[PDB]
Amino acid sequence: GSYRVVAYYISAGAYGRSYFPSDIDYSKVTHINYAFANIKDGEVVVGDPGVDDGGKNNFTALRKAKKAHPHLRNLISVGGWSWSSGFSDAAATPEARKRFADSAVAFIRKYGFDGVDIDWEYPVEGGAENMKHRPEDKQNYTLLTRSLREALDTAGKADGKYYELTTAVWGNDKFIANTEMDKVSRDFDFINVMSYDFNGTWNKFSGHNAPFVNDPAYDKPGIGKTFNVVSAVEAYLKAGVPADKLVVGVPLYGYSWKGCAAGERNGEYQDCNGKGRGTWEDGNLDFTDIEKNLLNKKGFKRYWNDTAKAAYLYNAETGEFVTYEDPQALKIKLDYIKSKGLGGAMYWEITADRKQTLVNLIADELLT
Numbered sequence: 001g002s003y004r005v006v007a008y009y010i011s012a013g014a015y016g017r018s019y020f021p022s023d024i025d026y027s028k029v030t031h032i033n034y035a036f037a038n039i040k041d042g043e044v045v046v047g048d049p050g051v052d053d054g055g056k057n058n059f060t061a062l063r064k065a066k067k068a069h070p071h072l073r074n075l076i077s078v079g080g081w082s083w084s085s086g087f088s089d090a091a092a093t094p095e096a097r098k099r100f101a102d103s104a105v106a107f108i109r110k111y112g113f114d115g116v117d118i119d120w121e122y123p124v125e126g127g128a129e130n131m132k133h134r135p136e137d138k139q140n141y142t143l144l145t146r147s148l149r150e151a152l153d154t155a156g157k158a159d160g161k162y163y164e165l166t167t168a169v170w171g172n173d174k175f176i177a178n179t180e181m182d183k184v185s186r187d188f189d190f191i192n193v194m195s196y197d198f199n200g201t202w203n204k205f206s207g208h209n210a211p212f213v214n215d216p217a218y219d220k221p222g223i224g225k226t227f228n229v230v231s232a233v234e235a236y237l238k239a240g241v242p243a244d245k246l247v248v249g250v251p252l253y254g255y256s257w258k259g260c261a262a263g264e265r266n267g268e269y270q271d272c273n274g275k276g277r278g279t280w281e282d283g284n285l286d287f288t289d290i291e292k293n294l295l296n297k298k299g300f301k302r303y304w305n306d307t308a309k310a311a312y313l314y315n316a317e318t319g320e321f322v323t324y325e326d327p328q329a330l331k332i333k334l335d336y337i338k339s340k341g342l343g344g345a346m347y348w349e350i351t352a353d354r355k356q357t358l359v360n361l362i363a364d365e366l367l368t
C-alpha cells in the first residue's frame with residue numbers, strides 16, 4: 001500500500017514494563033523506531049547497555065524479528081527529550097557532522113538496523129533543562145541531515161542495501177521557524193510529525209494532548225490557536241514537507257491532573273491541583289491502564305468535545321481529568337491521513353497499548 005505505520009519502541013520496555021521486542025505484533029507496523037541511542041563525544045552510542053546490546057539484548061530480538069518479517073524496517077532513534085544536548089555540537093562543523101554521520105553508519109551496521117531517526121528536541125530553542133542550542137542550528141539541522149544522507153547512501157552502496165533517514169519534529173510550529181523543512185525534506189525518507197504533547201501537566205490547567213482542530217473555547221494563557229493536529233499538518237505542508245512524506249503522530253499514553261474544578265465543562269480547560277494518577281509515573285497513564293481501570297469506570301466518566309474532536313475522562317469525586325486518544329478521535333485522524341494523501345501514522349509508544357485497541361485500528365485502516 002501507500003501508508004507507513006511507524007511504532008516507537010522504548011528501551012525501558014525491558015524493565016518493569018516487561019514488554020520486549022518479541023511482544024511486538026510486527027504484522028501491525030511497517031517500521032519500528034528504537035528509542036533511543038545517546039550522543040557521547042559527538043558520536044551515536046548505545047543508550048543502555050543493560051537492555052540494548054547486552055543484558056536483555058533488545059537488539060538481538062529486533063534482528064530476529066527482521067528475519068521472521070521481511071517487510072519490516074527497524075531504525076535507531078538518536079536523541080529524544082532527555083538526550084538531545086549533543087546535537088548542537090555535532091551539527092556545528094563539517095568535521096563534527098562527518099564524525100557523527102560515520103558513528104551512525106557504524107552503529108546500524110554493528111546492531112543490524114535499517115537506518116536512523118533524528119529526534120532532536122529542538123533546534124535553536126525548546127527542550128529539556130540540560131538541552132544545548134545555538135542560532136546556527138537552523139542552517140546546521142539541514143547540513144547534519146545532508147551529511148547523514150550522504151554517509152548512508154555511500155554505506156548502502158557498499159553494503160548492497162538501502163538505509164532510511166527520518167526525523168521526529170515538534171508539533172509546535174516554532175520548529176518550522178527554527179529549521180528549513182523545505183531543504184531537509186529532500187533528504188529525509190519521511191518526517192514523523194509529533195502531533196501530540198499540545199497540553200500536559202506543565203500547565204496547571206487541563207487540556208487535550210492531541211485535539212484534532214482548534215477549539216476557541218480553550219483560551220488559557222499562551223496556549224496557541226495552532227496547538228492541534230490539523231494546524232501542525234497544514235503548517236508542515238506549507239513549510240514544504242511533501243504530503244507523501246508527512247507521517248501523523250498519535251499518542252498511546254494519556255496525561256492526568258488532580259483537583260480540577262468542574263466548571264461548566266466537567267473539568268475541561270479548568271484550574272487543577274497538580275499531576276493525577278499515572279502508570280509508571282504520576283500524571284502519565286498507559287492506554288492499557290486507562291482502558292482497564294478508568295474508561296467509564298471507577299467514577300471516571302467519558303466526555304466528547306465535538307469542536308476539538310477529542311474525548312476526556314473526569315472523576316467529579318477527586319477532580320481528576322484524563323486526556324487520552326479515543327478510537328472516535330483516531331478514526332477521524334486516519335480518515336484525514338487518506339484525504340490529504342499523507343505518509344501514514346506514527347505512534348508513541350507501542351508498549352503503552354497491550355490489548356492493541358489503537359494499534360489494531362491504525363493497522364486495519366492504513367495497511368489492509
Ligand SMILES: CC(=O)N[C@@H]1[C@@H](O)[C@H](O[C@@H]2O[C@H](CO)[C@@H](O)[C@H](O)[C@H]2NC(C)=O)[C@@H](CO)O[C@H]1O
Pocket residue numbers: 080081121169170171172194196197198199200202227
Ligand atoms: C505545544 C508545545 O510547545 N508543547 C510542549 C511539549 O512538546 C513539551 O513536552 C515534550 O514534548 C516532546 C514532544 O515534542 C516529548 O518528547 C517530551 O517527552 C515532552 N516533555 C515532557 C516533560 O513531557 C512540554 C514539556 O515542557 O512543553 C510544552 O510547551
